[PDB]
Structures are given as structure tokens and as C-alpha cells.
Scaffold this active site. Structure first.
Site, PDB file in Angstrom:
ATOM      1  N   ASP A   1      -8.260   6.859  -3.294  1.00 12.19           N
ATOM      2  CA  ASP A   1      -6.880   6.600  -3.708  1.00 12.19           C
ATOM      3  C   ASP A   1      -6.820   5.359  -4.601  1.00 12.19           C
ATOM      4  O   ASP A   1      -6.845   4.223  -4.105  1.00 12.19           O
ATOM      5  CB  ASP A   1      -5.994   6.449  -2.470  1.00 12.19           C
ATOM      6  CG  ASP A   1      -4.526   6.661  -2.774  1.00 12.19           C
ATOM      7  OD1 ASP A   1      -4.099   6.283  -3.889  1.00 12.19           O
ATOM      8  OD2 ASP A   1      -3.793   7.208  -1.911  1.00 12.19           O
TER       9      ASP A   1
ATOM     10  N   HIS B   1      -1.514  17.677  -7.725  1.00  7.16           N
ATOM     11  CA  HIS B   1      -0.911  16.354  -7.762  1.00  7.16           C
ATOM     12  C   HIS B   1      -1.288  15.585  -9.023  1.00  7.16           C
ATOM     13  O   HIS B   1      -0.425  14.987  -9.682  1.00  7.16           O
ATOM     14  CB  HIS B   1      -1.354  15.591  -6.509  1.00  7.16           C
ATOM     15  CG  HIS B   1      -0.789  14.207  -6.413  1.00  7.16           C
ATOM     16  ND1 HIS B   1       0.530  13.972  -6.108  1.00  7.16           N
ATOM     17  CD2 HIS B   1      -1.367  12.991  -6.556  1.00  7.16           C
ATOM     18  CE1 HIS B   1       0.747  12.669  -6.069  1.00  7.16           C
ATOM     19  NE2 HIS B   1      -0.386  12.050  -6.349  1.00  7.16           N
TER      20      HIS B   1
HETATM   21  C1  HEM Z   1       1.132  10.204   0.491  1.00  7.24           C
HETATM   22  C2  HEM Z   1       1.496  10.509  -0.766  1.00  7.24           C
HETATM   23  C3  HEM Z   1       0.452  10.488  -1.913  1.00  7.24           C
HETATM   24  C4  HEM Z   1      -0.867  10.723  -1.849  1.00  7.24           C
HETATM   25  C5  HEM Z   1      -1.734  11.140  -0.645  1.00  7.24           C
HETATM   26  C6  HEM Z   1      -1.439  10.566  -3.166  1.00  7.24           C
HETATM   27  C7  HEM Z   1      -2.779  10.730  -3.477  1.00  7.24           C
HETATM   28  C8  HEM Z   1      -3.301  10.598  -4.753  1.00  7.24           C
HETATM   29  C9  HEM Z   1      -4.686  10.812  -5.110  1.00  7.24           C
HETATM   30  C10 HEM Z   1      -5.795  11.228  -4.115  1.00  7.24           C
HETATM   31  C11 HEM Z   1      -4.826  10.591  -6.423  1.00  7.24           C
HETATM   32  C12 HEM Z   1      -6.135  10.745  -7.242  1.00  7.24           C
HETATM   33  C13 HEM Z   1      -6.980   9.487  -7.386  1.00  7.24           C
HETATM   34  C14 HEM Z   1      -6.278   8.407  -8.177  1.00  7.24           C
HETATM   35  O1  HEM Z   1      -6.275   8.469  -9.435  1.00  7.24           O
HETATM   36  O2  HEM Z   1      -5.735   7.463  -7.546  1.00  7.24           O
HETATM   37  C15 HEM Z   1      -3.521  10.231  -6.949  1.00  7.24           C
HETATM   38  C16 HEM Z   1      -3.248   9.922  -8.266  1.00  7.24           C
HETATM   39  C17 HEM Z   1      -2.005   9.553  -8.743  1.00  7.24           C
HETATM   40  N1  HEM Z   1      -0.825   9.579  -8.025  1.00  7.24           N
HETATM   41 FE1  HEM Z   1      -0.635   9.997  -6.050  1.00  7.24          FE
HETATM   42  N2  HEM Z   1      -0.420  10.189  -4.021  1.00  7.24           N
HETATM   43  C18 HEM Z   1       0.755  10.140  -3.291  1.00  7.24           C
HETATM   44  C19 HEM Z   1       2.005   9.808  -3.777  1.00  7.24           C
HETATM   45  C20 HEM Z   1       2.302   9.547  -5.099  1.00  7.24           C
HETATM   46  C21 HEM Z   1       3.623   9.263  -5.638  1.00  7.24           C
HETATM   47  C22 HEM Z   1       4.912   9.210  -4.775  1.00  7.24           C
HETATM   48  C23 HEM Z   1       3.479   9.031  -6.962  1.00  7.24           C
HETATM   49  C24 HEM Z   1       4.536   8.704  -8.045  1.00  7.24           C
HETATM   50  C25 HEM Z   1       5.810   9.103  -7.952  1.00  7.24           C
HETATM   51  C26 HEM Z   1       2.079   9.187  -7.285  1.00  7.24           C
HETATM   52  C27 HEM Z   1       1.533   9.030  -8.540  1.00  7.24           C
HETATM   53  C28 HEM Z   1       0.197   9.136  -8.861  1.00  7.24           C
HETATM   54  C29 HEM Z   1      -0.378   8.832 -10.148  1.00  7.24           C
HETATM   55  C30 HEM Z   1       0.420   8.303 -11.355  1.00  7.24           C
HETATM   56  C31 HEM Z   1      -1.693   9.084 -10.086  1.00  7.24           C
HETATM   57  C32 HEM Z   1      -2.721   8.899 -11.220  1.00  7.24           C
HETATM   58  C33 HEM Z   1      -2.619  10.059 -12.214  1.00  7.24           C
HETATM   59  C34 HEM Z   1      -3.725   9.910 -13.222  1.00  7.24           C
HETATM   60  O3  HEM Z   1      -3.597   9.074 -14.158  1.00  7.24           O
HETATM   61  O4  HEM Z   1      -4.762  10.618 -13.077  1.00  7.24           O
HETATM   62  N3  HEM Z   1       1.386   9.495  -6.133  1.00  7.24           N
HETATM   63  N4  HEM Z   1      -2.604  10.225  -5.898  1.00  7.24           N
END
Ligand code: HEM
Length: 360
Positions: A171, A269
């Protein structure tokens, strides 16, 4: 220098986030209280972060070092509204709109003031958080409190490795890196009303994870929810580590997998959150795992205390969450149980206090 600590710093193992409500009423009285709390907190936070003895403190950290303590302070839009400072609310400081699937607990949401306490040591973090609370007591009381955690430096093979969350996912991979122009552009306000330039906007969401339902998926299905392999964090459009992969290889949203299917699902996601679907806009996700035991009904209550910093929540958090709410595969396994937006101002000058320019 220009910025409050606790944003570009690498997040340590422990978090205590407290939102506070000002306890007086009336714009003139609320204005005076808001300045008084910001004045006292700015000075106290500096003493605490230097590891110096704070007058009136408790001996709960006696025998401890400072443990990477940072204290980061933000203002809710309701503080400015209640203080009659509406004219100084920048466009970026707009309220977070209600969004489909929201299950926000009002008692755990919003707040006139927000205090993010981070440290590597849990006693240091709780202790400093209680000292900030004591010093504000005549003007402000906690509205909600979240404790959170991440892996410790001591136990990590390397303290700089990206944390795993409670879903077992790496994450933070596509966060902008601290000290880079990409980070500065994503995180720091660089235009608009002076009092918020070199500040950042923080969006908190207490996101419960449905971990029992999550665990019923195999890792292939779990990886497909995100768009990245759970094993090594690589994009499903790229090879895994050992076959040429590396987690810096960006997702390719039209690549086909070996079986001919779209490699990254249309509801993944990472597909729905990626900057290339949002005008290139990135955000700094600086969240913490949480585990609050059982809720009122006896059901498990653990998840991710999401905490994103951005120059403009309208084009970062809000724009991304609108897309996620409409279609994210992850939605099956998460519930947003709180929301709060805080304007986190620039560092105060010597002898000044945070957001002092509001009171001119
Ligand atoms: C429990 C809820 C969530 C989980 C488990 C989760 C998990 C993840 C994971 C595993 C990644 C891929 C690795 C990384 O690039 O960090 C990711 C990427 C990302 N997440 Fe989430 N996330 C959650 C909530 C959110 C929310 C609420 C937002 C925004 C409204 C968000 C925005 C993003 C963004 C912007 C990326 C990077 C996209 C990129 O540039 O590749 N996430 N998240």
C-alpha cells in the site's frame, strides 16, 4: 522550513488522530478561541517535537526518547465558518460531497480542528496526543479519536519498505516520492489565499475492511480487485518479479493477459484511481491500518484510516472517490465510515502561530 512536519516525513509505526470542536459560540468568541488554541498548540508542538519538557506534562514518557514524534495541525472549514471567516475559505477548501455508498458516522466525522500525532512508539504518540488535548481543554474538546498503526522500523527487513495493509496488499507504491517535483506539485498549495500557500489539504476516511469476506477469495481474485499482484505488487499488465517485473513498471490499461482477457479489469481499483484517468492529478496517501476490536453489534471493526494530502481535494480525493464509488471492485469489501477535510497550513514563522494570517 516552509511546511509542517508529518506530511513529507516517512510515516512511523503509530498514529493518534484527534478531531476537536471549539466549545464556545458566536463568531467573535469562536474567532478568539480558535486563535488561542492555534497559538498554544503551535508553541507546545514545537517543544514536544524537540523532545523538551512541556510545562504541566505527565510522566508517562519519563525514561523514553522522542521516537520520531511529529504533530501536524489542520483547520476544519467549520472553524472558519463558526469564526465568521467565510471569506478566507479558498475554493479548494470546499466540502467533501456525499457520495454513493457512504456510511459516514456523524460522530466520527468532520471537526473544527484536526491533530495528527505520529511516532514510532505507542506511548509517545498517546502521550503527546493527550498533552495537546489538555492544552486546548478550555476552548476545544475531542469530537473523535482514531488510533492507527503500521509496521515498525525495528521489525521491518528495511524501515523504508512500503507498508502492507490488513488486506495483505502493498500500500503506497504509486505515491509520489518525498523531495521530488511530482510530490511538491501533488501535495503543496502554491497559489490562492496566502494563508494556505505551502499548506496542504488533508482528507481522512475511516474505511472499514470486510476482512472475512475478503479472505474467501483466492489470491488470483484478490489481485484482480486491485489490478496488482498481491504477492509482489506488480501490475497485472506487467510480468511478475523474477520474469522481468518491478513494482515501478506502470500499469498498462489496454494490455491483454496470456488468456486473452483484459489484464487489468475495467473495475480494478488501480484503473479507476490512476492519474491518467484524472488529468494527471496525484495525491499522497499517508494512511494507517486500524483495528478497533468489535463494534457495537459484536462484529469485527478493522480497516484503513485513509489520510490523503493534496493541493486540491476537488481534483484529487473527490474526483477519484467519485469514480471509485461508481464502479470499484474494491467496494464489495470496504465501507467508508467517516470523512473529514482539514486545511493544514504552512509552518509558522518564528514567534508566530499556525494560520495566524486569518486573524489580520
Ligand atoms: C481500504 C480502502 C483502500 C484500499 C485497501 C486501497 C488499496 C490500494 C492499493 C493496494 C493500491 C496499489 C498500490 C499503490 O499504488 O499504493 C492503491 C492505489 C491507489 N489508491 Fe487505493 N485503497 C483504498 C482506498 C482508496 C481511496 C479512498 C482512494 C481515493 C479516493 C484511493 C486512491 C488510490 C490511488 C490514487 C492509488 C494510486 C493509483 C496509481 O497511481 O497507480 N485508494 N490503493
Amino acid at each position: 522550513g516552509r511546511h509542517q512536519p508529518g506530511i513529507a516525513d516517512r510515516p512511523p509505526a503509530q498514529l493518534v488522530f484527534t478531531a476537536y470542536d471549539l466549545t464556545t459560540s458566536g463568531p467573535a468568541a469562536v474567532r478568539t478561541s480558535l486563535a488561542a488554541v492555534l497559538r498554544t498548540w503551535t508553541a507546545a508542538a514545537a517543544v514536544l517535537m524537540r523532545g523538551e519538557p512541556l510545562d504541566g506534562a505527565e510522566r508517562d514518557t519519563q525514561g523514553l526518547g522522542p521516537a520520531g514524534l511529529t504533530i501536524t495541525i489542520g483547520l476544519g472549514a467549520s472553524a472558519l465558518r463558526r469564526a465568521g471567516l467565510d471569506a478566507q475559505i479558498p475554493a479548494e477548501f470546499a466540502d467533501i460531497p456525499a457520495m454513493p455508498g457512504d456510511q459516514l458516522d456523524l460522530a466520527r466525522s468532520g471537526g473544527d480542528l484536526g491533530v495528527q500525532v505520529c511516532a514510532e512508539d505507542p506511548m509517545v504518540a498517546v502521550s503527546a496526543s493527550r498533552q495537546m488535548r489538555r492544552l486546548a481543554a478550555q476552548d476545544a474538546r475531542p469530537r473523535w479519536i482514531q488510533r492507527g498503526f503500521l509496521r515498525s522500523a525495528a521489525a521491518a527487513f528495511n524501515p523504508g519498505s512500503t507498508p502492507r495493509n490488513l488486506m495483505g496488499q502493498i500500500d503506497g507504491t504509486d505515491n509520489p516520492g518525498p523531495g521530488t517535483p511530482r510530490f511538491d506539485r501533488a501535495v503543496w498549495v502554491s497559489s490562492g489565499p496566502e494563508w494556505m500557500r505551502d499548506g496542504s489539504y488533508l482528507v481522512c476516511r475511516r474505511i472499514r475492511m470486510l476482512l472475512d469476506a475478503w479472505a474467501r477469495l483466492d489470491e488470483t481474485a484478490q489481485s484482480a480487485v486491485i489490478g496488482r499482484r498481491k504477492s509482489d505488487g506488480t501490475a497485472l499488465s506487467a510480468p511478475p518479479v523474477g520474469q522481468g517485473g518491478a513494482e515501478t513498471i506502470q500499469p498498462d490499461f489496454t494490455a491483454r493477459a496470456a488468456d486473452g482477457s483484459l489484464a487489468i479489469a475495467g473495475n480494478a481499483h488501480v484503473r479507476l484511481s490512476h492519474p491518467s484517468f484524472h488529468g494527471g492529478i496525484a495525491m499522497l496517501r499517508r494512511g494507517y491500518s486500524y483495528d478497533d476490536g468489535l463494534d457495537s453489534a459484536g462484529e469485527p471493526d478493522a480497516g484503513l484510516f485513509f489520510a490523503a494530502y493534496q493541493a486540491d481535494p476537488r481534483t484529487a480525493f473527490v474526483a477519484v472517490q467519485r469514480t471509485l464509488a461508481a464502479g470499484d471492485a474494491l467496494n464489495t469489501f470496504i465501507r467508508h465510515t467517516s470523512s473529514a477535510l482539514f486545511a493544514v497550513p504552512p509552518a509558522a514563522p518564528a514567534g508566530g502561530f499556525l494560520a495566524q494570517g486569518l486573524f489580520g
